[PDB]
Amino acid sequence: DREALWSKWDNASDSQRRLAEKWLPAVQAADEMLNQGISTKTAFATVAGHYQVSASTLRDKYYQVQKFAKPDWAAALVSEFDEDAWQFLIADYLRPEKPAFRKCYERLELAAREHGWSIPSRATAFRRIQQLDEAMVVACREGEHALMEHLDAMQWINGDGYLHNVFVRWFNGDVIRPKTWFWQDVKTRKILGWRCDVSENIDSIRLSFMDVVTRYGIPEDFHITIDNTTGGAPNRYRFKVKEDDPKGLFLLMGAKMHWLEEYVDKHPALAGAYTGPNPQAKPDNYGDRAVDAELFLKTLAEGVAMFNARTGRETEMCGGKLSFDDVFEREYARTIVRKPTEEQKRMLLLPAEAVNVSRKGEFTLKVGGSLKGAKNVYYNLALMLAGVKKVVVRFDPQQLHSTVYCYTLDGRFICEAECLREYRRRQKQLKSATKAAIKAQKQ
């Protein structure tokens, strides 16, 4: 078997291979002289004469390589210690603690002393630690497991969210860190739409999508991706909105569902609000520094515009020359899209949590929050004329004073109905009664 021999040739150093290379023409030339029947003496004297080599060495090596085939002649020319201590050390390093090697080793020395174990050299120990596995380190921290056709413009869009590090004073006066959801065209990388709000919830996604399909339309083959590899909650309209299934609406749009920090967060105008990744940051300065919602949102819109308009984008489509806007304007004109009807757009208007319907076929929504306070009562004959107890109300905040649309709890449209700080005081009082009691318990 020439496998072990050739692996020995292979594993040899460059210097060793060079040595074999140097020794090969001398052995081969020698073979020629003997074939001619030249005296061994004259042949070796001649080779040792022309080539600087010991005649005896050449002779000996020739006989050694004689038994080997000629193509392989080159390849021819080329810790006992206590397992308990070793196990103890390995056991120690693999702990999530992951102590320093030299110190863990010293501890091991103490244990070895107590048990009388014969330990190997620190260098040997660590060497063997390297020899263990890439997987073992992960075994200690569970780390690696945490890592592990033609596309038209508008054909495939990706949705992503972003939590801002900038403090903004919102429309309701509260100072918060806004969260914005963005829709991006996968091919051209152009941002097609966005919506910003006080927290992460479906509304910003839904409405940014609405912005995207209203502005650019709905393609005939529509793919949407949100990599997850429901929001709702009370009551910005004083009535709760909403536990639903957005999923159905997306599938209905004819969409197949799949599962700037420099421009916004780092813009000069917000410098008092953005703190930066500062581990130590004084909280005493910031209540005054929080920027206005209008300024933040304007800076955001301009940041998006500048991100899209930025040339020198290194992508296939831009070829290091054009901007996302250029390639989007170019490719969008080569795709076939359809505009959404008024009805479709209205079906996307916001869902209110189920309200009770009386025997008379009327129900109530207590309007408030960002809208003018009022207790709206809606009515229709179809509500009293068939089976219903609870009903989901779909509405446009701007049209609450006139027409809403009632749906059954399972989603079937029934008919439309015509129209015939509050809880924050409790929230604040609760806050004070917390803080005072908390300080009193701390002391």
Partner 1 sequence: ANKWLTGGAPNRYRFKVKEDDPKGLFLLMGAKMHWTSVVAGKGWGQAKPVERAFGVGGLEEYVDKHPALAGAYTGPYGDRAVDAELFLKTLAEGVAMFNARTGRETEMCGGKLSFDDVFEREYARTIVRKPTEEQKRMLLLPAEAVNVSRKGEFTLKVGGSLKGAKNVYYNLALMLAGVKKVVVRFDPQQLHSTVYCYTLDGRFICEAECLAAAGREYRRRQKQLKSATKAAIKAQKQMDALEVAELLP
Partner DNA sequence: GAAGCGGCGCACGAAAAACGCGAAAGCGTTTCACGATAAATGCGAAAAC
Output the smallest distance, CB 113 to DNA, in A. Answer: 18
CA–CA dist 130, 83 (Å, integer): 18
Q: Please report how many Cα atoms fall inside a 13 Å half-sphere around the Cα of residue 201, on the Cβ side.
A: 15
Q: Which is nearer to DNA, 53 or 419 (CB)?
A: 53
Among residues 7, 39, 42, 57, which is the contact residue for DNA, using CB under 7 A? 57
Task: Determine if 61 is a binding residue for DNA (CB under 7 A).
Answer: yes
| 440 lies in the binding site for DNA (CB under 7 A) | no
Q: Which two tokens stand for residue 424?
A: 């924050």
Q: Could you say whether residue 190 binds DNA (CB under 7 A)?
A: no
Q: From partner 1, DNA, none, which one binds at residue 61 (CB under 5 to 8 Å depending on kind)?
A: DNA
Contact 318, 324 (CB under 8 A): yes
Q: Which stretch binds DNA (CB under 7 A): 94-102, 154-162, 289-297, 428-436?
A: 94-102
Alpha-carbon distances, residue 282 vs 101, 279, 423 (angstroms): 38, 10, 32
> Which partner, DNA, partner 1, none, binds residue 13 by CB below 5 to 8 Å per kind?
partner 1
Least distance in Å: CB of 7 to DNA?
14
Binding mask 98-137 for DNA (x = CB under 7 A): --xxxx-------------------x--x-----------
Closest-CA residue to 392 (of 279, 258, 248, 259): 248
**Is 326 annotated as belonging to a binding site?**
no
Q: Is 211 annotated as a binding residue?
A: no
| Closer residue to partner 1 (CB): 139 or 336 | 139
Q: Any contact of residue 54 with DNA (CB under 7 A)? A: yes
Residue ranges binding partner 1 (CB under 8 A): 2-3, 6-7, 9-14, 17, 20-21, 24-25, 28, 69-71, 73-75, 84, 87-88, 90-92, 94-95, 130-136, 138-139, 144-145, 148-149
Annotated binding-site ranges for Mg(2+):
160, 227
Which residues of the shown chain bind DNA in the complex (CB under 7 A)?
54, 56-57, 60-61, 100-103, 123, 126
